[PDB]
Short mmCIF file of N, CA and C and ligand atoms in Angstrom, two decimals:
data_model
loop_
_atom_site.label_atom_id
_atom_site.label_comp_id
_atom_site.label_asym_id
_atom_site.label_seq_id
_atom_site.Cartn_x
_atom_site.Cartn_y
_atom_site.Cartn_z
N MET A 21 8.52 6.00 8.06
CA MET A 21 7.00 5.92 7.40
C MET A 21 5.89 5.33 7.16
N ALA A 22 4.63 5.51 6.92
CA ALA A 22 3.96 4.96 7.57
C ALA A 22 3.76 3.53 6.78
N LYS A 23 2.94 2.61 7.64
CA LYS A 23 2.20 1.11 7.84
C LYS A 23 1.13 1.10 7.46
N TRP A 24 0.44 0.52 5.83
CA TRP A 24 -1.50 -0.11 5.41
C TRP A 24 -1.90 -1.18 5.18
N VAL A 25 -2.77 -1.37 6.44
CA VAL A 25 -3.21 -3.11 6.14
C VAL A 25 -3.89 -2.95 4.73
N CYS A 26 -4.25 -3.96 3.45
CA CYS A 26 -5.37 -4.55 2.96
C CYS A 26 -5.95 -5.61 3.87
N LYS A 27 -7.40 -4.70 4.21
CA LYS A 27 -8.29 -5.64 4.89
C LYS A 27 -9.17 -6.76 4.20
N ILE A 28 -8.85 -7.35 2.95
CA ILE A 28 -8.78 -8.22 2.88
C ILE A 28 -7.71 -9.32 2.87
N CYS A 29 -6.53 -9.28 2.35
CA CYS A 29 -5.72 -10.66 2.44
C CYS A 29 -4.96 -10.25 3.69
N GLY A 30 -4.36 -8.79 4.49
CA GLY A 30 -3.76 -8.76 6.11
C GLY A 30 -2.10 -8.42 4.84
N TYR A 31 -1.57 -8.29 3.77
CA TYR A 31 -1.00 -7.77 3.61
C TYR A 31 -0.14 -6.39 3.47
N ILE A 32 0.83 -6.15 3.82
CA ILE A 32 1.28 -4.93 4.41
C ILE A 32 2.07 -4.08 3.59
N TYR A 33 1.50 -2.86 3.29
CA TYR A 33 2.87 -1.37 2.19
C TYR A 33 3.20 -1.13 3.26
N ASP A 34 4.26 -1.11 3.08
CA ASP A 34 5.65 -0.15 3.84
C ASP A 34 5.76 0.48 3.50
N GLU A 35 5.67 2.30 3.31
CA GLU A 35 6.44 3.03 2.35
C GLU A 35 7.15 2.41 2.85
N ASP A 36 8.42 2.45 4.16
CA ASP A 36 9.68 1.89 3.48
C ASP A 36 9.98 1.28 2.75
N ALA A 37 9.50 -0.28 2.76
CA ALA A 37 9.77 -0.70 1.32
C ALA A 37 9.23 -0.47 -0.16
N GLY A 38 8.54 0.36 -0.11
CA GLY A 38 7.78 0.30 -2.03
C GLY A 38 7.20 -1.21 -2.27
N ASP A 39 7.98 -1.15 -3.16
CA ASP A 39 6.73 -2.45 -3.79
C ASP A 39 7.52 -2.52 -5.79
N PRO A 40 8.57 -2.79 -5.48
CA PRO A 40 9.44 -2.75 -6.18
C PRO A 40 9.31 -3.13 -7.65
N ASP A 41 8.90 -4.69 -7.51
CA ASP A 41 8.74 -5.77 -7.82
C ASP A 41 6.91 -5.18 -8.89
N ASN A 42 6.74 -3.85 -9.00
CA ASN A 42 5.41 -4.43 -9.74
C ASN A 42 5.27 -2.26 -9.97
N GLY A 43 6.86 -1.74 -9.47
CA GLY A 43 7.41 -0.61 -10.60
C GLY A 43 6.89 1.01 -8.91
N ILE A 44 7.01 0.16 -7.89
CA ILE A 44 7.09 1.39 -6.90
C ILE A 44 7.88 1.63 -5.71
N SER A 45 9.01 2.18 -6.05
CA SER A 45 10.73 2.33 -5.38
C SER A 45 10.16 2.74 -3.81
N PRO A 46 11.18 1.90 -2.36
CA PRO A 46 11.00 2.05 -1.87
C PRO A 46 10.32 3.60 -1.32
N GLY A 47 9.77 4.38 -0.28
CA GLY A 47 9.80 5.26 0.40
C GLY A 47 8.81 6.28 -0.31
N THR A 48 8.03 5.16 -1.66
CA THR A 48 6.99 5.80 -1.76
C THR A 48 5.65 6.22 -0.97
N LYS A 49 4.99 7.20 -0.38
CA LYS A 49 3.21 7.07 0.28
C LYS A 49 2.38 6.57 -0.79
N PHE A 50 2.04 5.74 0.67
CA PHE A 50 0.38 5.33 -0.11
C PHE A 50 -0.09 6.58 -0.67
N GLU A 51 -0.09 7.61 -0.30
CA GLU A 51 -0.96 8.07 -1.50
C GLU A 51 -0.19 8.23 -3.25
N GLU A 52 0.98 8.16 -3.06
CA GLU A 52 1.58 8.12 -3.90
C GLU A 52 1.49 7.13 -5.09
N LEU A 53 0.87 5.67 -4.26
CA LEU A 53 1.22 4.92 -5.86
C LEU A 53 -0.18 5.16 -6.24
N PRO A 54 -0.01 4.39 -8.11
CA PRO A 54 -1.10 5.02 -8.81
C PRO A 54 -2.13 4.91 -8.75
N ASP A 55 -2.61 5.45 -9.13
CA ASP A 55 -4.51 5.06 -8.86
C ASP A 55 -4.91 3.74 -8.94
N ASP A 56 -4.29 3.07 -10.21
CA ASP A 56 -4.64 2.12 -10.69
C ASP A 56 -3.74 0.10 -10.01
N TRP A 57 -2.54 1.21 -8.56
CA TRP A 57 -1.83 0.00 -8.33
C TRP A 57 -2.78 -0.65 -7.46
N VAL A 58 -2.57 -2.23 -7.59
CA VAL A 58 -3.07 -3.28 -6.59
C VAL A 58 -2.40 -3.75 -5.37
N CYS A 59 -3.54 -4.55 -3.81
CA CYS A 59 -2.33 -5.27 -3.21
C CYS A 59 -1.38 -5.88 -4.70
N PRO A 60 -0.61 -6.42 -4.41
CA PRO A 60 0.53 -7.22 -4.93
C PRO A 60 -0.45 -8.64 -4.62
N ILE A 61 -0.45 -9.04 -3.80
CA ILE A 61 -1.06 -10.48 -2.98
C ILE A 61 -2.21 -10.49 -4.18
N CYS A 62 -3.41 -9.84 -3.09
CA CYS A 62 -5.12 -10.60 -3.80
C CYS A 62 -5.20 -9.54 -4.78
N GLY A 63 -4.77 -7.91 -5.07
CA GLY A 63 -5.13 -7.51 -5.84
C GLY A 63 -6.41 -6.82 -6.21
N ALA A 64 -6.93 -6.15 -4.25
CA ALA A 64 -8.06 -5.00 -4.17
C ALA A 64 -6.99 -3.56 -4.38
N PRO A 65 -8.55 -3.29 -4.81
CA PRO A 65 -8.15 -1.52 -5.05
C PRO A 65 -6.88 -1.01 -3.97
N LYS A 66 -7.20 0.41 -3.94
CA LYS A 66 -6.27 1.19 -3.07
C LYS A 66 -7.52 1.53 -1.61
N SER A 67 -8.84 1.10 -2.42
CA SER A 67 -9.93 1.70 -1.37
C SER A 67 -9.60 0.67 -0.46
N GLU A 68 -9.00 -0.07 -0.92
CA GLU A 68 -8.97 -1.07 0.46
C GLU A 68 -8.42 -1.42 1.35
N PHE A 69 -7.82 -0.23 1.55
CA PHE A 69 -6.55 -0.08 2.15
C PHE A 69 -6.21 0.41 3.67
N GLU A 70 -6.14 0.10 5.09
CA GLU A 70 -6.56 1.11 6.41
C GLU A 70 -4.84 1.67 6.42
N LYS A 71 -5.24 2.40 6.97
CA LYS A 71 -3.25 3.51 7.02
C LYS A 71 -3.21 3.15 8.76
N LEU A 72 -1.86 1.81 9.19
CA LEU A 72 -1.81 1.79 10.26
C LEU A 72 -1.78 2.71 11.20
N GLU A 73 -3.03 3.40 11.97
CA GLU A 73 -2.26 4.64 12.88
C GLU A 73 -3.66 5.00 13.49
N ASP A 74 -3.13 5.62 15.10
CA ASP A 74 -4.36 5.65 15.51
C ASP A 74 -5.41 6.50 14.57
FE1 FE B 2 -4.63 -7.68 -0.24
NA1 NA B 3 -0.56 -12.32 -6.24
#
């Protein structure tokens, strides 16, 4: 699955890992993260992530 970078701090949201400590099971696509999910490192909103692909 895809990976997304936090353009603030460099955290990688890896869809295969999810974010279970913050309520997100492995395999959750970035689009399906709740609108108010934030970077677990710096708190950046979803708007500050970019998908790692061409
Ligand atoms: Fe961040
Ligand atoms: Na933190």
